[PDB]
Amino acid sequence: LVGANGAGRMRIWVNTQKYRDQNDQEQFLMKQKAVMGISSAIEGVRCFGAI
């Protein structure tokens, strides 16, 4: 959804993956009635404790 000279651009993704619940039910991974906008500057960290 870009403007003219690479300005104000939006990339639209649609996600409807369905994981199986803890209680063994179908549930939508991305929430279906919602809009999420995420950037790569969230800089997330995979934490792993002790086994």
């Binding site: 369905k18 994981y19 199986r20 619940d21 803890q22 063994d24």
Partner: protein, 50 residues
Amino acid sequence: AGLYTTYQLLEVQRKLKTLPAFFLQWFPRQINFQEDMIAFDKVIQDVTRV
């Protein structure tokens, strides 16, 4: 003419109706088996679970 007329016959006009293969184009494999039945197996493996 006289008793009855003469005739020059042209070619026979044969209206011929066919039924060409539109649905068979998705059925490519042919199996000519002599046995009784045909066994299938379908397996669904649910992995997408937390």
